[PDB]
Tab-separated table of C-alpha atoms and ligand atoms in Angstrom:
chain	number	residue	atom	x	y	z
A	119	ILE	CA	45.234	39.669	16.163
A	120	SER	CA	48.346	41.526	14.874
A	121	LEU	CA	48.437	43.476	11.577
A	122	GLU	CA	52.239	44.009	11.924
A	123	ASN	CA	52.613	40.308	10.845
A	124	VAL	CA	50.482	40.696	7.697
A	125	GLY	CA	52.759	39.670	4.822
A	126	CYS	CA	51.968	41.493	1.271
A	127	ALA	CA	53.625	41.521	-2.241
A	128	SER	CA	52.872	42.798	-5.507
A	129	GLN	CA	54.826	42.429	-8.719
A	130	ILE	CA	54.205	44.267	-11.943
A	131	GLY	CA	55.290	41.217	-14.171
A	132	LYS	CA	55.836	42.248	-17.881
A	133	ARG	CA	53.080	45.003	-17.922
A	134	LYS	CA	53.511	48.472	-18.657
A	135	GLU	CA	51.796	49.256	-15.203
A	136	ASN	CA	50.592	47.799	-11.856
A	137	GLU	CA	46.944	48.043	-11.299
A	138	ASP	CA	46.499	45.646	-8.615
A	139	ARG	CA	45.638	47.505	-5.276
A	140	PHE	CA	45.412	46.011	-1.744
A	141	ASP	CA	44.697	46.989	1.819
A	142	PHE	CA	43.997	45.843	5.322
A	143	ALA	CA	42.996	47.556	8.610
A	144	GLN	CA	41.093	47.576	11.976
A	145	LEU	CA	37.832	49.007	11.210
A	146	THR	CA	36.593	48.744	14.836
A	147	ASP	CA	37.497	46.826	18.158
A	148	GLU	CA	35.611	44.183	16.535
A	149	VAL	CA	36.194	44.081	12.735
A	150	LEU	CA	39.077	43.755	10.915
A	151	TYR	CA	39.478	44.667	7.000
A	152	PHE	CA	41.515	42.886	3.995
A	153	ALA	CA	41.072	43.391	0.460
A	154	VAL	CA	42.717	42.960	-2.926
A	155	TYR	CA	41.603	44.871	-5.986
A	156	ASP	CA	42.732	43.909	-9.270
A	157	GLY	CA	42.033	46.903	-11.746
A	158	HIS	CA	41.894	46.883	-15.407
A	159	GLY	CA	41.608	49.634	-18.246
A	160	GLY	CA	43.208	52.298	-15.960
A	161	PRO	CA	43.726	51.755	-12.170
A	162	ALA	CA	40.887	54.520	-11.546
A	163	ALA	CA	38.305	51.730	-10.313
A	164	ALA	CA	40.821	49.784	-8.460
A	165	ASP	CA	41.868	52.965	-6.675
A	166	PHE	CA	38.408	54.181	-6.052
A	167	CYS	CA	37.763	50.894	-4.204
A	168	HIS	CA	40.914	51.193	-2.171
A	169	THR	CA	40.154	54.613	-1.145
A	170	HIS	CA	36.558	54.504	-0.307
A	171	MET	CA	35.656	50.856	0.676
A	172	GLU	CA	36.566	51.336	4.421
A	173	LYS	CA	34.171	54.403	4.679
A	174	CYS	CA	31.241	52.370	3.019
A	175	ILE	CA	31.848	49.343	5.243
A	176	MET	CA	32.084	51.442	8.317
A	177	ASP	CA	28.978	53.546	7.472
A	178	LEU	CA	27.042	50.161	7.270
A	179	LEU	CA	28.648	48.411	10.457
A	180	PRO	CA	26.034	49.853	12.772
A	181	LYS	CA	23.085	49.589	10.221
A	182	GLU	CA	23.488	45.770	9.156
A	183	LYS	CA	24.825	42.925	11.412
A	184	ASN	CA	24.727	40.297	8.720
A	185	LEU	CA	28.304	40.743	7.288
A	186	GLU	CA	27.452	38.987	4.182
A	187	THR	CA	24.431	41.481	3.623
A	188	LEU	CA	26.646	44.309	4.557
A	189	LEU	CA	29.512	43.438	1.912
A	190	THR	CA	26.794	43.004	-0.673
A	191	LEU	CA	25.327	46.597	-0.033
A	192	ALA	CA	28.837	48.019	0.202
A	193	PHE	CA	29.880	46.601	-3.315
A	194	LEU	CA	26.540	47.826	-4.973
A	195	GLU	CA	26.949	51.229	-3.142
A	196	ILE	CA	30.653	51.866	-3.917
A	197	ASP	CA	29.832	50.651	-7.544
A	198	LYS	CA	27.176	53.419	-7.566
A	199	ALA	CA	29.501	56.010	-6.549
A	200	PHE	CA	32.259	55.002	-8.912
A	201	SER	CA	29.870	55.179	-11.907
A	202	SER	CA	28.694	58.652	-10.925
A	203	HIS	CA	32.558	59.333	-10.206
A	204	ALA	CA	33.407	58.214	-13.676
A	205	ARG	CA	30.517	60.114	-15.495
A	206	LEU	CA	31.504	63.194	-14.239
A	207	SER	CA	35.233	63.239	-14.773
A	208	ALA	CA	36.950	64.883	-17.630
A	209	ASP	CA	38.888	61.488	-18.367
A	210	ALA	CA	36.547	59.382	-20.556
A	211	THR	CA	38.680	56.505	-20.204
A	212	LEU	CA	37.045	55.897	-16.561
A	213	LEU	CA	33.907	54.881	-18.625
A	214	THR	CA	35.629	51.320	-19.221
A	215	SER	CA	37.870	51.227	-16.019
A	216	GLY	CA	36.929	48.583	-13.582
A	217	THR	CA	38.096	46.063	-10.957
A	218	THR	CA	37.718	42.813	-9.274
A	219	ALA	CA	37.129	43.041	-5.535
A	220	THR	CA	37.871	40.616	-2.793
A	221	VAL	CA	36.898	41.824	0.355
A	222	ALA	CA	37.459	40.001	3.944
A	223	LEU	CA	36.204	41.024	7.136
A	224	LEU	CA	36.799	39.229	10.480
A	225	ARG	CA	34.654	39.982	13.312
A	226	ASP	CA	35.397	39.335	16.896
A	227	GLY	CA	38.498	37.419	15.923
A	228	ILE	CA	36.475	34.417	14.818
A	229	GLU	CA	33.919	35.188	12.296
A	230	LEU	CA	35.357	35.529	8.808
A	231	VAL	CA	33.250	36.630	5.900
A	232	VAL	CA	34.498	37.237	2.313
A	233	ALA	CA	32.738	38.894	-0.626
A	234	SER	CA	33.948	39.155	-3.956
A	235	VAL	CA	33.517	39.790	-7.672
A	236	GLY	CA	35.952	38.949	-10.354
A	237	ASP	CA	38.736	36.419	-10.621
A	238	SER	CA	40.821	37.655	-7.557
A	239	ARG	CA	40.721	34.930	-4.864
A	240	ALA	CA	40.693	34.425	-1.194
A	241	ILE	CA	41.758	31.046	0.403
A	242	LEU	CA	42.295	29.733	4.186
A	243	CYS	CA	44.991	27.809	4.885
A	244	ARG	CA	45.042	25.574	8.110
A	245	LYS	CA	47.032	22.637	8.843
A	246	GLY	CA	48.646	23.344	5.393
A	247	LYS	CA	45.473	22.364	3.746
A	248	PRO	CA	43.724	24.978	1.531
A	249	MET	CA	39.959	25.994	1.639
A	250	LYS	CA	38.710	27.954	-1.139
A	251	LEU	CA	36.636	30.988	0.005
A	252	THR	CA	35.551	32.460	-3.421
A	253	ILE	CA	34.568	31.329	-7.037
A	254	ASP	CA	36.074	33.091	-10.155
A	255	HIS	CA	33.343	34.881	-12.161
A	256	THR	CA	34.389	33.933	-15.631
A	257	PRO	CA	32.324	33.208	-18.795
A	258	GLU	CA	33.120	29.761	-18.168
A	259	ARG	CA	30.411	29.235	-15.694
A	260	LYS	CA	27.165	28.376	-17.021
A	261	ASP	CA	25.234	30.460	-14.400
A	262	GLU	CA	27.296	33.676	-15.664
A	263	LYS	CA	27.210	32.871	-19.094
A	264	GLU	CA	23.302	32.487	-18.949
A	265	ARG	CA	22.996	36.059	-17.182
A	266	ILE	CA	25.045	37.704	-19.884
A	267	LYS	CA	23.228	36.126	-22.742
A	268	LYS	CA	19.784	36.955	-21.028
A	269	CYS	CA	21.069	40.630	-20.574
A	270	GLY	CA	22.127	41.059	-24.258
A	271	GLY	CA	25.813	40.558	-23.646
A	272	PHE	CA	27.778	38.071	-25.450
A	273	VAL	CA	30.817	35.823	-25.183
A	274	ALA	CA	33.777	36.126	-27.865
A	275	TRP	CA	36.918	34.316	-27.906
A	276	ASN	CA	41.014	34.193	-28.402
A	280	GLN	CA	39.582	32.560	-24.500
A	281	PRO	CA	36.059	33.740	-23.427
A	282	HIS	CA	35.478	37.415	-23.247
A	283	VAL	CA	32.222	39.367	-22.279
A	284	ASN	CA	31.422	41.272	-25.356
A	285	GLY	CA	35.005	40.817	-26.641
A	286	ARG	CA	36.340	42.921	-23.870
A	287	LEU	CA	36.384	41.437	-20.360
A	288	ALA	CA	37.652	38.198	-19.103
A	289	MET	CA	35.349	38.046	-16.079
A	290	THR	CA	31.629	38.495	-15.552
A	291	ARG	CA	31.310	40.754	-12.368
A	292	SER	CA	33.311	43.676	-11.390
A	293	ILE	CA	33.193	47.170	-9.708
A	294	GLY	CA	33.158	49.760	-12.503
A	295	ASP	CA	32.932	48.749	-16.389
A	296	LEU	CA	29.936	51.239	-16.864
A	297	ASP	CA	29.339	50.306	-20.454
A	298	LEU	CA	29.045	46.340	-19.772
A	299	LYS	CA	26.775	46.749	-16.771
A	300	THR	CA	23.649	46.398	-18.681
A	301	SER	CA	25.035	43.383	-20.693
A	302	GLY	CA	25.282	41.327	-17.420
A	303	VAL	CA	28.399	42.398	-15.713
A	304	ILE	CA	27.010	42.907	-12.380
A	305	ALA	CA	28.719	44.328	-8.952
A	306	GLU	CA	27.073	42.060	-6.897
A	307	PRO	CA	29.411	39.838	-4.985
A	308	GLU	CA	29.103	36.258	-3.969
A	309	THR	CA	29.699	35.648	-0.359
A	310	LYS	CA	31.181	33.110	1.927
A	311	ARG	CA	31.093	32.950	5.809
A	312	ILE	CA	33.109	30.776	7.972
A	313	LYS	CA	34.264	30.294	11.592
A	314	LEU	CA	38.101	29.993	12.500
A	315	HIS	CA	39.539	27.141	14.368
A	316	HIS	CA	39.944	27.613	18.215
A	317	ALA	CA	43.093	25.595	18.472
A	318	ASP	CA	44.826	25.566	14.872
A	319	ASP	CA	46.530	28.759	13.547
A	320	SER	CA	45.085	29.923	10.062
A	321	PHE	CA	46.157	31.908	7.314
A	322	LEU	CA	43.920	33.864	4.993
A	323	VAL	CA	45.454	34.357	1.686
A	324	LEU	CA	44.327	37.079	-1.229
A	325	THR	CA	45.646	36.655	-4.599
A	326	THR	CA	45.089	38.268	-7.949
A	327	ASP	CA	44.807	36.142	-11.050
A	328	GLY	CA	48.354	36.778	-11.915
A	329	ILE	CA	48.995	34.355	-9.058
A	330	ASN	CA	46.349	31.991	-9.788
A	331	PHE	CA	47.616	31.240	-13.234
A	332	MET	CA	50.375	29.408	-12.108
A	333	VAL	CA	50.239	28.676	-8.414
A	334	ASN	CA	47.301	26.364	-7.240
A	335	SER	CA	46.076	26.904	-3.642
A	336	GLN	CA	47.810	23.662	-2.538
A	337	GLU	CA	51.017	25.030	-3.443
A	338	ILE	CA	50.137	28.700	-1.675
A	339	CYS	CA	49.450	26.960	1.675
A	340	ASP	CA	52.867	24.996	1.293
A	341	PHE	CA	54.636	28.464	1.131
A	342	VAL	CA	52.551	29.854	4.143
A	343	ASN	CA	53.271	26.659	5.880
A	344	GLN	CA	57.185	26.554	4.997
A	345	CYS	CA	58.142	30.254	4.688
A	346	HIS	CA	59.648	32.109	7.679
A	347	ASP	CA	57.085	34.778	8.064
A	348	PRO	CA	53.836	35.655	6.424
A	349	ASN	CA	56.196	38.444	4.346
A	350	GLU	CA	58.373	36.107	2.990
A	351	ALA	CA	55.750	33.658	2.203
A	352	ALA	CA	53.867	36.597	0.195
A	353	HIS	CA	56.960	37.341	-1.594
A	354	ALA	CA	57.643	33.520	-2.517
A	355	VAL	CA	54.306	33.040	-3.806
A	356	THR	CA	54.391	36.150	-6.335
A	357	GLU	CA	58.007	35.219	-7.357
A	358	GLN	CA	57.003	31.626	-8.047
A	359	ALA	CA	54.101	32.738	-10.200
A	360	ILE	CA	56.514	34.937	-12.307
A	361	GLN	CA	59.237	32.242	-12.618
A	362	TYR	CA	56.639	29.754	-13.660
A	363	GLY	CA	55.602	32.244	-16.704
A	364	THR	CA	53.017	34.766	-15.330
A	365	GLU	CA	53.166	38.080	-16.974
A	366	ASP	CA	50.396	39.945	-15.273
A	367	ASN	CA	50.505	41.972	-12.102
A	368	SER	CA	50.897	39.414	-9.411
A	369	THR	CA	49.609	40.461	-5.849
A	370	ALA	CA	49.512	38.268	-2.525
A	371	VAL	CA	48.328	38.999	0.931
A	372	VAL	CA	49.047	36.701	3.752
A	373	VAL	CA	47.458	37.115	6.947
A	374	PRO	CA	48.210	35.298	10.279
A	375	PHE	CA	45.100	34.293	12.596
A	376	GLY	CA	45.992	33.169	15.814
A	377	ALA	CA	44.147	30.186	17.423
A	378	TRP	CA	41.897	31.808	20.404
B	1	MG	MG1	42.943	52.231	3.649
B	2	MG	MG1	44.360	43.908	-14.066
B	3	MG	MG1	45.072	40.491	-13.071
């Protein structure tokens, strides 16, 4: 698989700042990495993940063969690290910096494992058909809503927000909300790639999901010249449709073995 073909686009929208981060790399001969991090309350947490997620994963690869298990551990460990980092910095705003994290690992060119927390997304496009790889952690979900309430948190409105502050129920960072139920533990999904059909991994932040459903994303991937043109087209449509938030898309082409 060729990382030269990865397409990526990130538009600030109408925000003062762009707090979306994204990355990809080949960790080892057998493992490729792809990630988006949608930061809020300052980029600190999103930046921390961007900077360190690869090390956390690579330190785990030889210890843990189950990649769902590995990503779960990595997420929790990096969250531990950011919490210490935050509590130690002079900048007291880090205490309320946090981020989604959507991380994909592809092993041996066929085994795709995705972990995320928050409302950024991964989908797989194959034959122009989307398959969802993540489910958004929002207060709308009964199970999430119940943990928040059982942990002592609440949900307010003006649209649902954890303790009147956070539009999602899991994240990396958000130190003050951790005991109120906003956990760093990801949900995970594992699939095998198709041997004959090409497929595309697409990572997006909620700026994009607000306005472009995942079928429409597969159409762009299916119709646009290269992944790069597709990534730009997806983000630009989101903005055209009325999105004002940071909008980020990563399009990864997988060849069929
Ligand atoms: Mg990197
Ligand atoms: Mg953000
Ligand atoms: Mg966002």
